[PDB]
Design a protein around this nucleic acid. Structure first.
Ligand SMILES: CCc1c(C#N)c(SCc2ccc(N(C)S(C)(=O)=O)cc2)nc(N(C)CCNC)c1C#N
Ligand SMILES: [Zn+2]
Ligand SMILES: [Zn+2]
Length: 842
DNA sequence: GAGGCCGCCTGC
DNA sequence: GCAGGTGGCCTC
């Protein structure tokens, strides 16, 4: 035979007889030993597990419990992983003892007590270095969220110790945390049992608390007539508008007609369970009775009621609704305004999910004020901000209250000056970050300006966005591009992390950072952090979901030192167009998401172009007055926030690029209706403001793809159309109102949708760029009504900069500073997650 | 400096 | 095939 128990049994739990030791052919096995197990096809490598229990089964025979390790190559790291590094996972199962192939040694590599001083790995060590030739683990891994975290520290029961499986225990904790449950009973009525409290997903709900509910959870009293359908596309003069046919897509870039409704908000009146005919309550079916809260836009006053109202302003209602407890999307605080000790602004700024109501809403009296008697300091982290720009990321972190950016590195001098203007106590370095790091590593204390260099222990948080020029393609690395990456600013920034070993680390970038070079930039970044011993994760965030009227996805890498909690990604605050909120990432055929659970709705309504800039005075093309009058108070909640509490007599930087006479005429001929762009231009001559003329565009070749006009005219302008001929200059066709190059190459660029495009008041900005040009890719830069490009101030508003935030240089310098920044509201959301970790640190 | 001009690749 | 991701040359 081969397998024989060592000793007598220790417990007989039914059909199972547990043992403490077993003997397989020439080895002995005890609880706690590590083993390998062959897979079902010997092509796949060995599985590795820890033995947590051993028992004879009355029917199936000799058994053990395997708590599997995860091979590094099976994580997001893939083949960048240390070949002998394993990761802890909550994966386990009962297994026949006959599946064991060998006993294996696995070492736990704990970070030293002096970990923060052990940095100084060279880039080759960070990128490609491995540990000393044995199986080891340092970190636990979440396979769905791609999170590397310090190993959990669960403790066993006096009855668990002999068979304890930490994976089993943690999975039981998760299941119990996720199943909805009642806790305390309140009163026993004839048909149902009332409760004072319930819990769901770790959140405690009591009678009186506010709940978030899906928009589908209940309707309002409103009996309305159905609105009209989409704008009936009436025919147009195709000779006057030869490019209008290119708008057959019916889809409007930057439009909010597809954004979901925000949550329903209710106050728990009743938590109850149906009582069986037999007396006992059915506690698998928990129901909630709420009073409905009206948002302004839910009243007979439609959407326009939202224009001026506070974003968290509600009205009490006495309409009631019964929903399932499992429908609750979260807890929120809804409290009567004129009974809180603080003021409403301090309240709204002091915590998440805070709403207030001053009046009530009688629906079909359509009136206000209905029955009210029912309604009853850590120190900041010293922060180094690399590639800081003018300071949007540092500004959002400061607003979150977690950071003092004491050092910034910004190579472009106008942005460095702007950072200095907003951060007088900061030390701003303009030289190359490699130079600075090499100086520090050589033992220097000051740079060539006499500025004091940060040293180990000074830097507690490190953040930045490193440029990726040279390796921003999607195709795989070769030797040349990989050398560029090894000597890149990304790797320099990682070397900063390795040297200074801050408590928290943030790398922000364009969304496609997660896909560059077949995701190898991302995988190697994570590999470096793991090699340093950091907890770390990655994800994609949409800036609009955190309160700007702009679509701007960013890739985010977060890391936290051993001893810290690894931050979560922030839950979306505002609803936003779903097409702009694709946050998942596929790496090596594995789809990763973040912890974000608000996927289809959120607490606050979407922020619009109207919210963003309806208060700014009209200005002209080329507006250059640096200091003007606002001409009135803020109108929207967003404007109130960005203008701030203190009266501001002067509006700064509401200045616009001075476009040419031809470009100005084009802009003057873009209609104001939503979705308008160059394809709506007329094919006319126009006398320009400099006496010159704008010529009619007329065709030169037959586009077989697009065919001919409504009445025979060719829709082609170039020998290009032949698809096999070359460009002949005989149709260059300069100084045309309808630009020539857009029909020239439009068939391969989605009709150049959005160029010379107008913003719409109800919509959002396209990604705010460093130099707004109507004929650039992000060409939707025209004001909704004025015949001009958006101003520097309007771009700053689109990024969520306070109006008081100072910029520096000429108009193009200021546009670039604004367009390169992280939006402060996005940075603040991230920082508040970091603050949660600072407060939770054991 | 301001505008004209406009590739290659991915996900669906 | 549509929609989108990425700015960034040159030139006049
Ligand atoms: C649609 C407009 C456009 C655009 C646009 N938009 C771009 S962008 C190229 C790009 C990609 C990545 C990076 N990075 C370093 S990175 C870190 O990823 O930002 C920078 C530039 N190229 C275009 N070409 C003609 C290719 C380049 N000429 C040879 C065109 C065009 N027509
Ligand atoms: Zn288990
Ligand atoms: Zn051509």
């Amino acid at each position: 035979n081969r397998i024989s128990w060592v000793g007598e049994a220790v417990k007989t739990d039914g059909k199972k007889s547990y043992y403490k030791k077993v003997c397989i052919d020439a080895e002995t096995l005890e609880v706690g030993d590590c083993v390998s197990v062959i897979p079902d096809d010997s092509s796949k490598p060995l599985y590795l597990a820890r033995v947590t229990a051993l028992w004879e089964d009355s029917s199936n025979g000799q058994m053990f419990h395997a708590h599997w390790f995860c091979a590094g190559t099976d994580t997001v790291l893939g083949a960048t992983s240390d070949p002998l590094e394993l990761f802890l996972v909550d994966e386990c199962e009962d297994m026949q003892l006959s599946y064991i192939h060998s006993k294996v040694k696995v070492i736990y590599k704990a970070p030293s007590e002096n970990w923060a001083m052990e940095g100084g790995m060279d880039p080759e060590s960070l990128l490609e270095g491995d540990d000393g030739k044995t199986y080891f683990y340092q970190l636990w891994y979440d396979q769905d969220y791609a999170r590397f975290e310090s190993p959990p520290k669960t403790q066993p029961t006096e009855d668990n110790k002999f068979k304890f499986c930490v994976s089993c225990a943690r999975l039981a904790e998760m299941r119990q945390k996720e199943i909805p449950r009642v806790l305390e009973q309140l009163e026993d009525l004839d048909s149902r049992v009332l409760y004072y409290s319930a819990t769901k997903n770790g959140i405690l709900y009591r009678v009186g608390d506010g709940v978030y509910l899906p928009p589908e959870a209940f309707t309002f009293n409103i009996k309305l007539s159905s609105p009209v359908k989409r704008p009936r596309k009436e025919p147009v003069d195709e000779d006057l508008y030869p490019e209008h046919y290119r708008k057959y897509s019916d889809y409007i870039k930057g439009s909010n007609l597809d954004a979901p409704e925000p949550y329903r908000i209710g106050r728990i009146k009743e938590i109850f369970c149906p009582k069986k005919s037999n007396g006992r309550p059915n506690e698998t079916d928990i129901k909630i009775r709420v009073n409905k809260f009206y948002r302004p836009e839910n009243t007979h006053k439609s959407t326009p009621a939202s224009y001026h109202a506070d974003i968290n302003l509600l009205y009490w209602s006495d309409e009631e609704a019964v929903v399932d407890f499992k429908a609750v999307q979260g807890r929120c605080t809804v409290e009567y305004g004129e009974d809180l000790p603080e003021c409403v602004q301090v309240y709204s700024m002091g915590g998440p999910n805070r709403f207030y109501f001053l009046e009530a809403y009688n629906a079909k009296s359509k009136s206000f004020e209905d029955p009210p008697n029912h309604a009853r300091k850590l120190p900041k982290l010293r922060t180094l901000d690399v590639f800081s720009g003018c300071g949007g990321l540092s500004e959002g972190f400061h607003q979150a209250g977690i950071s003092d950016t004491l050092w910034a590195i910004e190579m472009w001098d106008p942005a460095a000056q702007a950072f200095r203007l907003n951060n007088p106590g900061s030390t701003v370095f303009t030289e190359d970050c490699n130079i600075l790091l090499k100086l520090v590593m050589a033992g220097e204390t000051t740079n060539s300006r006499g500025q004091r260099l940060p040293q180990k222990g000074d830097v507690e948080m490190l953040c930045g966005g490193p440029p990726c020029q040279g390796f921003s393609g999607m195709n795989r690395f070769n030797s040349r591009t990989y050398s560029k990456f090894k000597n890149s600013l990304v790797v320099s920034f990682l070397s900063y992390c390795d040297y200074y070993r801050p408590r928290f680390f943030l790398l922000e970038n364009v969304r496609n950072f997660v896909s560059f070079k077949r995701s190898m930039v991302l995988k190697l970044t994570l590999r470096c952090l793991v090699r340093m011993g950091y907890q770390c994760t990655f994800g994609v965030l949409q800036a609009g979901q955190y309160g700007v009227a702009q679509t701007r996805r960013r890739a985010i890498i977060l890391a936290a030192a051993p001893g810290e909690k690894l931050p979560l990604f922030p839950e979306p605050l505002h609803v936003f167009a779903p097409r702009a909120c694709q946050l998942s990432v596929v790496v090596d055929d594995k789809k990763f998401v973040s912890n974000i659970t608000r996927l289809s709705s959120g607490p606050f309504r979407t922020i619009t172009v109207r919210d963003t800039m309806s208060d700014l005075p009209e200005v002209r093309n080329g507006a250059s007055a640096l200091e003007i009058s606002y001409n009135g108070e803020p109108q929207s909640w967003f404007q109130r926030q960005l203008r701030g509490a203190q009266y501001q007599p002067i509006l700064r930087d509401h200045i616009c690029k001075d476009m040419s006479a031809l470009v100005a005429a084009r802009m003057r001929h873009i209609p104001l209706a939503p979705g308008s762009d160059w394809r709506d231009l007329p094919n006319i001559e126009v006398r320009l403001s400099d006496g010159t003329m704008a010529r009619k565009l007329r065709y030169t070749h037959h586009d077989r793809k697009n065919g001919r006009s409504s009445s025979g005219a060719l829709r082609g302008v170039c020998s290009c159309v032949e698809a096999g001929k070359a460009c002949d200059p005989a149709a260059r066709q300069f100084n045309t109102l309808i630009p020539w190059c857009l029909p020239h190459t439009g068939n391969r660029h989605n009709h150049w949708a959005g160029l010379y495009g107008r913003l719409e008041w109800d919509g959002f900005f396209s990604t705010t760029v460093t130099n707004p040009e109507p004929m650039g890719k992000q060409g939707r830069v025209l004001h909704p009504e004025q015949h001009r490009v958006v101003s520097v101030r309007e771009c700053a508003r689109s990024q969520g900069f306070p109006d008081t935030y100072r910029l520096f240089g000429n108009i193009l310098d200021k546009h670039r500073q604004v367009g390169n920044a992280v939006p402060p509201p996005l940075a603040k959301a991230i920082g508040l997650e970091i603050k949660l970790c600072m407060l939770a640190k054991a």
